[PDB]
CSV table of C-alpha atoms and ligand atoms in Angstrom, one decimal:
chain,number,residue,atom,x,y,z
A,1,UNK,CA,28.4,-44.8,-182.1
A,2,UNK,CA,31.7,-45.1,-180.1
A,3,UNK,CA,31.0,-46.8,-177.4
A,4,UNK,CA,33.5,-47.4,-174.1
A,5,UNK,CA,34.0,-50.6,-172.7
A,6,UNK,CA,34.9,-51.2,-168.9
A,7,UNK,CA,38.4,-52.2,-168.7
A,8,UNK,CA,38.1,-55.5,-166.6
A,9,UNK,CA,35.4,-55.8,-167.9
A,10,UNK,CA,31.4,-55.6,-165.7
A,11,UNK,CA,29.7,-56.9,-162.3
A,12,UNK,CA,27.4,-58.8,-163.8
A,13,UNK,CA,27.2,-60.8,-160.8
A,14,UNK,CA,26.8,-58.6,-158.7
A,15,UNK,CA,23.7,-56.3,-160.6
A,16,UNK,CA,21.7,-59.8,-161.0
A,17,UNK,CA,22.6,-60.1,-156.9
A,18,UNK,CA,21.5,-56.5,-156.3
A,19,UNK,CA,18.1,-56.6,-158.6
A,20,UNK,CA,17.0,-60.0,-156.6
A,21,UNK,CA,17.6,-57.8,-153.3
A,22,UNK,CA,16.2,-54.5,-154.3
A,23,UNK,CA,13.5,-53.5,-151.4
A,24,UNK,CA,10.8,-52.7,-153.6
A,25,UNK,CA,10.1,-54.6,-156.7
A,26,UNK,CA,7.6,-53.0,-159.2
A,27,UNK,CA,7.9,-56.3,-161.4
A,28,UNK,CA,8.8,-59.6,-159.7
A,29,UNK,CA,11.1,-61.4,-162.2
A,30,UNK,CA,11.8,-64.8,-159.9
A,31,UNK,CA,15.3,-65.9,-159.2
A,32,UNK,CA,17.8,-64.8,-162.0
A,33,UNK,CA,21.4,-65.9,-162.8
A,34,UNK,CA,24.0,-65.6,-165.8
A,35,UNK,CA,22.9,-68.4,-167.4
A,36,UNK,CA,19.8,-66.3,-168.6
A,37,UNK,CA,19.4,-64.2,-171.7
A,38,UNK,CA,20.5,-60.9,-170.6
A,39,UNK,CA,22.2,-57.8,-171.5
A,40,UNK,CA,23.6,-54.5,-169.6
A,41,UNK,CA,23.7,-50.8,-171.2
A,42,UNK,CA,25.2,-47.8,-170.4
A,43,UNK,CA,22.9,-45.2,-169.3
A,44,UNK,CA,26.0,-42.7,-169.0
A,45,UNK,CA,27.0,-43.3,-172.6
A,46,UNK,CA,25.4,-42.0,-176.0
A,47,UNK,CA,22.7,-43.8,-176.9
A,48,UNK,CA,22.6,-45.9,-174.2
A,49,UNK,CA,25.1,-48.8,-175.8
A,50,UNK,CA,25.0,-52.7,-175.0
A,51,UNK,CA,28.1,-53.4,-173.1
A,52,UNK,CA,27.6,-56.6,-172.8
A,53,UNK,CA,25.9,-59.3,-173.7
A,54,UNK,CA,25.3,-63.3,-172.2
A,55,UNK,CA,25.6,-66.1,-173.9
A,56,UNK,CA,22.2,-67.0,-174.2
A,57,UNK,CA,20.8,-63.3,-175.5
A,58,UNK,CA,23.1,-63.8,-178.5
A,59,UNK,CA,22.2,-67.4,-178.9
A,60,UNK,CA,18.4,-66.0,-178.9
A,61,UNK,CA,18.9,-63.4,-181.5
A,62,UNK,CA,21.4,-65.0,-183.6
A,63,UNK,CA,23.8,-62.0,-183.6
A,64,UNK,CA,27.4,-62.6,-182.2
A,65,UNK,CA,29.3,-60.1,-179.3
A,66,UNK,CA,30.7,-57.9,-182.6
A,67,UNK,CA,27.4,-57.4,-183.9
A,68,UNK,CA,25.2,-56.6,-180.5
A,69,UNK,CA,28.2,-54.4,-178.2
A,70,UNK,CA,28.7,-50.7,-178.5
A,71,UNK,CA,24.5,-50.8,-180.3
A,72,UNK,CA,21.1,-49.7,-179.0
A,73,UNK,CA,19.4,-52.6,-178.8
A,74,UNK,CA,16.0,-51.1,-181.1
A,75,UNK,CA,18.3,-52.5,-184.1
A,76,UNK,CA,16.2,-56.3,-183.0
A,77,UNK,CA,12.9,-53.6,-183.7
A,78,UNK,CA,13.9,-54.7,-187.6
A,79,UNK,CA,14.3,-58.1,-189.6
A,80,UNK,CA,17.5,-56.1,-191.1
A,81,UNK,CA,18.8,-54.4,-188.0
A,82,UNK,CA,18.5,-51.4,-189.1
A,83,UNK,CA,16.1,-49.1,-186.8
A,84,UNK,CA,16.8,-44.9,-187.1
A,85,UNK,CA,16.3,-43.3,-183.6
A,86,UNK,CA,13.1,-41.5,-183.3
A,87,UNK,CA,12.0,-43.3,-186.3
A,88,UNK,CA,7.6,-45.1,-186.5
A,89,UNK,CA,8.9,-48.2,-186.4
A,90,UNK,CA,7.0,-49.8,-189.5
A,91,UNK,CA,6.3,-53.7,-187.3
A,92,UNK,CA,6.7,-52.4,-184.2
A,93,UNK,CA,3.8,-51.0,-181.6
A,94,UNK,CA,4.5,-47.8,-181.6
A,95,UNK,CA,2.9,-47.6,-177.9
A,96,UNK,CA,4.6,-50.2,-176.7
A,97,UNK,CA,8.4,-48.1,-177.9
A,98,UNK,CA,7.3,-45.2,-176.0
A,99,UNK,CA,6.5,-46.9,-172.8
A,100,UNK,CA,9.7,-48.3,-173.0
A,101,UNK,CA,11.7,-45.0,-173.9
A,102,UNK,CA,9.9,-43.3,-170.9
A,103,UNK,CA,10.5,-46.3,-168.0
A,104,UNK,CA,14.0,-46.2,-169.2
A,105,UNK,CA,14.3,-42.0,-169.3
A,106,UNK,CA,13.0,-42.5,-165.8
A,107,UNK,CA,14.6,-45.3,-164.3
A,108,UNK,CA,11.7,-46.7,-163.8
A,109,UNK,CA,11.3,-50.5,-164.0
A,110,UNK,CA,9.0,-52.4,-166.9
A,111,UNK,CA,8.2,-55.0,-168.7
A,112,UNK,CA,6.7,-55.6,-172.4
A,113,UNK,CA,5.8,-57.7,-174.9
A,114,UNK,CA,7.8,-56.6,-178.2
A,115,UNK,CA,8.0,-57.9,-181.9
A,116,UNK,CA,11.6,-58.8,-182.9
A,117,UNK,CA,13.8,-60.4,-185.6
A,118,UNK,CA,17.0,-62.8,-185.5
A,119,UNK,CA,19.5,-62.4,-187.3
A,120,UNK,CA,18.3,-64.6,-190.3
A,121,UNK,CA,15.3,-62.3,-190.1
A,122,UNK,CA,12.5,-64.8,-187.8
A,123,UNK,CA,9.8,-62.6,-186.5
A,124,UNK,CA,9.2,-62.9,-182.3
A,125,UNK,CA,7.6,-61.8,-179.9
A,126,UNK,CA,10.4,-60.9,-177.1
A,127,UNK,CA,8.8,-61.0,-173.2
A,128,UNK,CA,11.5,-58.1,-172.1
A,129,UNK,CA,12.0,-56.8,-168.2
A,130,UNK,CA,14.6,-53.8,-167.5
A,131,UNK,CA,15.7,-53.0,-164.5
A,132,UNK,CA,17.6,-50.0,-163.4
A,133,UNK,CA,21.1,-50.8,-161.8
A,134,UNK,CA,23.2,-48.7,-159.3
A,135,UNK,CA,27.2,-49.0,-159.8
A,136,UNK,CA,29.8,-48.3,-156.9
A,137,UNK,CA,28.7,-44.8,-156.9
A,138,UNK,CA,25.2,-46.1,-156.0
A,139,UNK,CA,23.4,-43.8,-158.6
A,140,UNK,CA,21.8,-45.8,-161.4
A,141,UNK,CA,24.2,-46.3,-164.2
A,142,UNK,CA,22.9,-49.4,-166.2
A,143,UNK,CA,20.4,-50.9,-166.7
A,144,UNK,CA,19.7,-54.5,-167.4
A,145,UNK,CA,17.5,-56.5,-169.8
A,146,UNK,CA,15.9,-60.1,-169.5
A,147,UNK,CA,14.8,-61.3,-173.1
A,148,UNK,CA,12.2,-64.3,-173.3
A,149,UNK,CA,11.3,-65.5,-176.7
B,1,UNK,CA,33.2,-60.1,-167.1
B,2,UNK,CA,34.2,-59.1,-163.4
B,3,UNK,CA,34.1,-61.8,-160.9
B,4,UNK,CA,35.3,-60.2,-157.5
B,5,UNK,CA,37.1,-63.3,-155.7
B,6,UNK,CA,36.9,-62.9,-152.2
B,7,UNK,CA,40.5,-63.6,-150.4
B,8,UNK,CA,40.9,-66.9,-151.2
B,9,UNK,CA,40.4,-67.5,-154.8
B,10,UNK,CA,36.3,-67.9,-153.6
B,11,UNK,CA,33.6,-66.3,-155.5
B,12,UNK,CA,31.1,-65.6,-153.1
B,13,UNK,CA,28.9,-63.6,-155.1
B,14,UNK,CA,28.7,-66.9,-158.0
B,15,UNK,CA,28.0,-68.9,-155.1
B,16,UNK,CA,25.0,-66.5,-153.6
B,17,UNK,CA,23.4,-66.4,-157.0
B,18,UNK,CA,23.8,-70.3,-157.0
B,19,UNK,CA,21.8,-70.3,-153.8
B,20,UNK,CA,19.1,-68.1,-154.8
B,21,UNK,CA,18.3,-70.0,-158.0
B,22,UNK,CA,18.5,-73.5,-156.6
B,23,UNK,CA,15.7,-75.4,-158.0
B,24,UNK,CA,14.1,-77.4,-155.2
B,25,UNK,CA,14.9,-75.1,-151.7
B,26,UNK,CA,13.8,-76.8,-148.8
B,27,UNK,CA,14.3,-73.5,-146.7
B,28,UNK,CA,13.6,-70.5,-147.4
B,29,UNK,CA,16.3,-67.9,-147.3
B,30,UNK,CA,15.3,-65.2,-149.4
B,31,UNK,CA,17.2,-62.7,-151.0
B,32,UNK,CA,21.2,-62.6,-149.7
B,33,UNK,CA,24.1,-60.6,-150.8
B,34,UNK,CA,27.4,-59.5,-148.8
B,35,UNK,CA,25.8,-57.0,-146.9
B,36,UNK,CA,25.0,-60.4,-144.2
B,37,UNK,CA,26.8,-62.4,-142.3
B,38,UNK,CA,28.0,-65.3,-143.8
B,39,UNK,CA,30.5,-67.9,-143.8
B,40,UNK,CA,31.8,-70.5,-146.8
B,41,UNK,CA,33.1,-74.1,-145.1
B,42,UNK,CA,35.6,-76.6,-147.1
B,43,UNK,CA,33.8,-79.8,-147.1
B,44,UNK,CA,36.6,-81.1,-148.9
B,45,UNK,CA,38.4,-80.9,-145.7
B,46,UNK,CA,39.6,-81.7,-142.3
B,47,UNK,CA,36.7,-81.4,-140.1
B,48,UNK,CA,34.6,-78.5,-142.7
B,49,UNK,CA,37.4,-75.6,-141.7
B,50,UNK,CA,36.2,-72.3,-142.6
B,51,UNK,CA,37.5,-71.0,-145.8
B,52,UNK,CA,35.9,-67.3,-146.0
B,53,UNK,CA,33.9,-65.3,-143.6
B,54,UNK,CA,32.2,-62.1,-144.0
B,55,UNK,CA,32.9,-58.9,-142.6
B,56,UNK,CA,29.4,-59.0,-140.9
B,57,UNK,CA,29.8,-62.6,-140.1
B,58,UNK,CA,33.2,-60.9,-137.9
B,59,UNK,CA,31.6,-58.3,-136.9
B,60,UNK,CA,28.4,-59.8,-135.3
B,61,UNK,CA,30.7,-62.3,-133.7
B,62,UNK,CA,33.5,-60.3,-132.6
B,63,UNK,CA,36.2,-62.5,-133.9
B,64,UNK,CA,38.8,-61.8,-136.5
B,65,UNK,CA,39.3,-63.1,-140.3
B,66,UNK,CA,42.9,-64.8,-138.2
B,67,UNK,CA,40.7,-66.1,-135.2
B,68,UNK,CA,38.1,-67.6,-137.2
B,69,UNK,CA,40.0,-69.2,-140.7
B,70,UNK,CA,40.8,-72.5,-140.8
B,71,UNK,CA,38.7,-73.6,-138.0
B,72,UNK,CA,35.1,-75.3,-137.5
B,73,UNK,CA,32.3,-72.8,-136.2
B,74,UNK,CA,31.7,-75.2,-133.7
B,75,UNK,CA,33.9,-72.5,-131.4
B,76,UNK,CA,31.2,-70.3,-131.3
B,77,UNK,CA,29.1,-72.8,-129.2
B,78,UNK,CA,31.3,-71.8,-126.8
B,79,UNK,CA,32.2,-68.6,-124.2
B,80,UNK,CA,35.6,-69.2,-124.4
B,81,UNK,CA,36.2,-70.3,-128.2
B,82,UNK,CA,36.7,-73.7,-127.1
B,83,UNK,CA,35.0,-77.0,-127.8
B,84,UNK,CA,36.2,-79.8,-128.8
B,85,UNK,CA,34.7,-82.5,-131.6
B,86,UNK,CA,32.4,-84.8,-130.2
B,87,UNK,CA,32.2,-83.2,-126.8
B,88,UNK,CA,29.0,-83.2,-124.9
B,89,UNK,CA,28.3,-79.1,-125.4
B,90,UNK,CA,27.3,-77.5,-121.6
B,91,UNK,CA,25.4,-74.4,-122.8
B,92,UNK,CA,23.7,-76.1,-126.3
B,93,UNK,CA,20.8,-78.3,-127.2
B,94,UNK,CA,22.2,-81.7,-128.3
B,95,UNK,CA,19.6,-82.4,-130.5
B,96,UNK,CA,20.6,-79.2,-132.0
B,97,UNK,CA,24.1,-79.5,-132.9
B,98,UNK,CA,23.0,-83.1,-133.9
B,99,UNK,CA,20.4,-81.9,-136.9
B,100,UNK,CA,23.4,-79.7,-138.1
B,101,UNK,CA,25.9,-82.7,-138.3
B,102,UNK,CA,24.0,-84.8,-140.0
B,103,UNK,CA,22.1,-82.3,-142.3
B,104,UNK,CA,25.6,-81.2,-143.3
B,105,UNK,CA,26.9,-84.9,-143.9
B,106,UNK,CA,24.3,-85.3,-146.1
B,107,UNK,CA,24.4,-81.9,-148.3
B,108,UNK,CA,21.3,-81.2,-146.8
B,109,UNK,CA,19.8,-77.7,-146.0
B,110,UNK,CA,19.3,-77.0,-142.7
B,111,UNK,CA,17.9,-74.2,-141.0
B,112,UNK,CA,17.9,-73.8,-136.2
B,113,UNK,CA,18.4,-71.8,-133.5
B,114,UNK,CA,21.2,-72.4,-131.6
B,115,UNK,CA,22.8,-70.1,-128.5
B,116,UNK,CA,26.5,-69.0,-129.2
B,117,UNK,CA,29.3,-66.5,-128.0
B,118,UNK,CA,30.4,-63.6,-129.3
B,119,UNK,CA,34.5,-63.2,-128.6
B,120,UNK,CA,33.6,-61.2,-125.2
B,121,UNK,CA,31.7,-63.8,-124.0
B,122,UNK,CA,28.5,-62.2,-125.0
B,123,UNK,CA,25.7,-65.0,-126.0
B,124,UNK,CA,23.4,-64.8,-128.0
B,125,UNK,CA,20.5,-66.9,-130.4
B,126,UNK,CA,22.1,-67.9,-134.0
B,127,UNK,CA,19.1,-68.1,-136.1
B,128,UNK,CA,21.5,-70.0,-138.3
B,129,UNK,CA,21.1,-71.6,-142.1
B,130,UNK,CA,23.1,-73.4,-143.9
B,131,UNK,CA,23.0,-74.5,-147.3
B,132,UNK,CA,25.6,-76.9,-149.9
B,133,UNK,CA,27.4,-75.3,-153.0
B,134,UNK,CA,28.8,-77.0,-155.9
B,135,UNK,CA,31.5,-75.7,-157.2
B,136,UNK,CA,32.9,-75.6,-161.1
B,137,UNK,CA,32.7,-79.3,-161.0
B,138,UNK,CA,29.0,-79.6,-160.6
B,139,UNK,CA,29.5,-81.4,-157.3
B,140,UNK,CA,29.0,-80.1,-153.5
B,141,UNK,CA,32.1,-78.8,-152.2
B,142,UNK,CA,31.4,-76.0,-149.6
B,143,UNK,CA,28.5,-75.1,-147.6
B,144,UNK,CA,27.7,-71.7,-146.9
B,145,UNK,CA,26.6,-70.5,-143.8
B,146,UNK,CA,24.6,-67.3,-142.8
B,147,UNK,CA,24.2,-66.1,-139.0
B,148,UNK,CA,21.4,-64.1,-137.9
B,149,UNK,CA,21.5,-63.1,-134.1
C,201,LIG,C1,18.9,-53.0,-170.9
C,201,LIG,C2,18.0,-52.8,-172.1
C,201,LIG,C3,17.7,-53.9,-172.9
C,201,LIG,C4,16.8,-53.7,-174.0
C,201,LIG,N1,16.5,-54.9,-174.8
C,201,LIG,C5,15.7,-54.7,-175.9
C,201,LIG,C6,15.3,-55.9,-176.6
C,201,LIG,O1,15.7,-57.1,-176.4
C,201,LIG,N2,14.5,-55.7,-177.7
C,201,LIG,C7,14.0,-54.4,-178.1
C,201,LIG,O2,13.3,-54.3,-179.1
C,201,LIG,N3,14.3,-53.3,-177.4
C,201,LIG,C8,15.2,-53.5,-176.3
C,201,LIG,N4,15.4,-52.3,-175.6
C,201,LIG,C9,14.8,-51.0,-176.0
C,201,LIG,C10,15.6,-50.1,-176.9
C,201,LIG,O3,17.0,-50.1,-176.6
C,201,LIG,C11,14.9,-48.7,-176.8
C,201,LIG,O4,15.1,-48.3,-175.4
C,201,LIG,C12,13.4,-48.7,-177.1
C,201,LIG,O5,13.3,-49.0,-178.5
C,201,LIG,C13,12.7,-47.4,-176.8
C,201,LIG,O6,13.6,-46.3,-177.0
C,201,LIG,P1,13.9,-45.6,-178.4
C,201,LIG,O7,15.1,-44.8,-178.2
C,201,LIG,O8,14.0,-46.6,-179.4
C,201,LIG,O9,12.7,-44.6,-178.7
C,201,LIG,P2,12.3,-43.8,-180.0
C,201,LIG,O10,13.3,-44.1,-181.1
C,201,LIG,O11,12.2,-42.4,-179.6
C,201,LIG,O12,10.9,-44.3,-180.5
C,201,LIG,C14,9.7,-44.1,-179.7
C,201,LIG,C15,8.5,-44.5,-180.6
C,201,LIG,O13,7.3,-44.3,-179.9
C,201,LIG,C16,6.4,-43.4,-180.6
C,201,LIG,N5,6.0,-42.4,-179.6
C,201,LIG,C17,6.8,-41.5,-178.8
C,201,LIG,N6,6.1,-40.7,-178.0
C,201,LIG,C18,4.8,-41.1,-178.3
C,201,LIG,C19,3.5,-40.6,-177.7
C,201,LIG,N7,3.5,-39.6,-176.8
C,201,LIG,N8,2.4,-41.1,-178.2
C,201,LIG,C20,2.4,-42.1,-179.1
C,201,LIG,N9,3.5,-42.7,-179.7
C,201,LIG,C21,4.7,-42.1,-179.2
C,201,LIG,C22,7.2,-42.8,-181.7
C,201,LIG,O14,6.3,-42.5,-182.9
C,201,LIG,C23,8.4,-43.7,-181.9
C,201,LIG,O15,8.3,-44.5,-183.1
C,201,LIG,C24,16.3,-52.4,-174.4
C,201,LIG,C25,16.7,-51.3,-173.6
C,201,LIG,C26,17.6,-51.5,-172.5
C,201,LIG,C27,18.0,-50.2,-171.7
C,202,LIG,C1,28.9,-73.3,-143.5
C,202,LIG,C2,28.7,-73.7,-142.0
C,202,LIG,C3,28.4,-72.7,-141.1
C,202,LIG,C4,28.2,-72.9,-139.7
C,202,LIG,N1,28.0,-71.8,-138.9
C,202,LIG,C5,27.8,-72.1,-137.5
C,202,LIG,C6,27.5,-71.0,-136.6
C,202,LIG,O1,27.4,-69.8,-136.9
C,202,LIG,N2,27.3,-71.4,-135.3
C,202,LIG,C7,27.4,-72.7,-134.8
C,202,LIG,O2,27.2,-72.9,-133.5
C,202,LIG,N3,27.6,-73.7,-135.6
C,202,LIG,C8,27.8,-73.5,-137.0
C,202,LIG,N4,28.0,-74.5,-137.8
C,202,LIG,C9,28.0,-75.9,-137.3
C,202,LIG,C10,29.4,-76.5,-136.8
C,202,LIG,O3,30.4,-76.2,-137.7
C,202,LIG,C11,29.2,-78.1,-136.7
C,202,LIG,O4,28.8,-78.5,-138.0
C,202,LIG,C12,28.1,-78.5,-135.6
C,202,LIG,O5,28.5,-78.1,-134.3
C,202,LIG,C13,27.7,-80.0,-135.7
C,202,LIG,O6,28.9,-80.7,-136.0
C,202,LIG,P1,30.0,-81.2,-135.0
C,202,LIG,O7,31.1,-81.7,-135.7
C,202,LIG,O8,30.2,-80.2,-134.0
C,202,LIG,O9,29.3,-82.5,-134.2
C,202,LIG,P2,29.7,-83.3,-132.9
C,202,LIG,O10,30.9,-82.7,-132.3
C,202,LIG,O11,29.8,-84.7,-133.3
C,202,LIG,O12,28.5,-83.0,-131.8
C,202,LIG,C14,27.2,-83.5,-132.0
C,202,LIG,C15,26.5,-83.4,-130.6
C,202,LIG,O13,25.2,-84.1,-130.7
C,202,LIG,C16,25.0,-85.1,-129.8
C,202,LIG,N5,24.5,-86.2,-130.5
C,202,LIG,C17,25.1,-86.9,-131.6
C,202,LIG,N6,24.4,-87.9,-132.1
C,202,LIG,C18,23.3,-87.9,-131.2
C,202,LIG,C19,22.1,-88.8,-131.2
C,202,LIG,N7,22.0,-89.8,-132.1
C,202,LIG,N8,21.2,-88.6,-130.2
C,202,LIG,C20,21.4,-87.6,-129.3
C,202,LIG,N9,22.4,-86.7,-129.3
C,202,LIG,C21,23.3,-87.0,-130.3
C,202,LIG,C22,26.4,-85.4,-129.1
C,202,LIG,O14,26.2,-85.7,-127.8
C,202,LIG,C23,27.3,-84.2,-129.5
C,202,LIG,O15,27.6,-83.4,-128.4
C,202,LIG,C24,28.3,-74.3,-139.2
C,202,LIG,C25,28.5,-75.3,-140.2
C,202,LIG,C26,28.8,-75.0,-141.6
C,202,LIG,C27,29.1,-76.2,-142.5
């Protein structure tokens, strides 16, 4: 991976403003601010990279900035971080990947219920919503996760 | 992170997302964002002088950013831009612009209908809600307005 960062850095802000607006929510998620686990990725970019990452996501996980940015975030899929693309995830519900893959290929919104691991290797059970999000171009660009343990 | 601060040094979007995740409303507003008309008020000064309005908030009213910073909204209760503190308004409900001086004296959400004046005279119904913002300091220091005609 060789992921890009925005310089200036993103509009976080303004994506959490714009999901609470959208006109027509498939998944309500409530009201939503930065103090919330979260995390935005580049659609645009290989792999669709983390590009940033709140405070409270890497709190969650255990995993600081320099170990989450510029990474698909499947690497949680693993107690050792280390998940191959396209790979049968060997604790993961296989069903459960897909449906995620596809919502994602399609912008489409979702939310599931997914087994992951902190850093030190803790099992979980992450309640995950992604949303789509449009940039200044107003195509969809990113897209942004809520993680619950 | 990018936090767009609107003309002043005010970050308008923080404080929208601050509104939208308060925990105990006592008005609904719903979702909010830019695209509206609203206004941000220094309580922390002389007589709650407008600090930031927004383009729609200009539009709708006809006024500019220079006729409208610095000074009380109170002028819009007015044909002319005039009225003076205290004054006994002609063409608005007393018990009106009563509710909204107290509700704002004591940081508390307020939500009425009150006639006003666009720049050419023009009146109209202000379906008008305001509600308090704390600022970095945890404390209430502006109050954000949003006009609805
Ligand atoms: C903003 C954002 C936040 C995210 N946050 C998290 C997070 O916190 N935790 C997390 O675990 N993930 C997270 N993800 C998900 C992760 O990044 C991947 O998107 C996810 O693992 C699915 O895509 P993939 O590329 O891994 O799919 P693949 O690697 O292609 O794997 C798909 C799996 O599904 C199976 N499969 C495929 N097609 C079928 C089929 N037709 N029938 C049956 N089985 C099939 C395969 O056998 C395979 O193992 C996030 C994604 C985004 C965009
Ligand atoms: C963020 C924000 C946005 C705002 N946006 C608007 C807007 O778009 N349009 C708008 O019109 N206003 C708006 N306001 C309201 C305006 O700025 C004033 O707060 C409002 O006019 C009331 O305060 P005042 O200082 O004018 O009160 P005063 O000048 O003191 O007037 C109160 C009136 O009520 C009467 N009154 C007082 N006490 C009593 C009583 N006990 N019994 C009977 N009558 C009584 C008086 O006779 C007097 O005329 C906004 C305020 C804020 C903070």
């Amino acid at each position: 991976m060789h992921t890009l960062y925005a310089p200036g850095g993103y509009d976080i802000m303004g994506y959490l403003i714009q999901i609470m607006n959208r006109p027509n929510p498939q998944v309500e998620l409530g009201p939503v601010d930065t103090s919330v686990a979260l995390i935005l990725c580049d659609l645009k970019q290989k792999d669709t990279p983390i590009v940033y990452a709140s405070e409270a996501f890497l709190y969650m996980t255990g995993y600081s900035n320099a170990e989450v940015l510029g990474r698909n975030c499947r690497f949680l899929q693993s107690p050792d971080g280390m998940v191959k693309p396209k790979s049968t995830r060997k604790y993961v519900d296989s069903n459960t990947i897909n449906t995620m893959r596809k919502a994602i290929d399609r912008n489409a919104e979702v939310q599931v219920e997914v087994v992951n691991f902190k850093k030190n290797g803790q099992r979980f059970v992450n309640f995950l919503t992604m949303i789509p999000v449009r940039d200044e171009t107003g195509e969809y660009r990113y897209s942004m996760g809520f993680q619950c343990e």
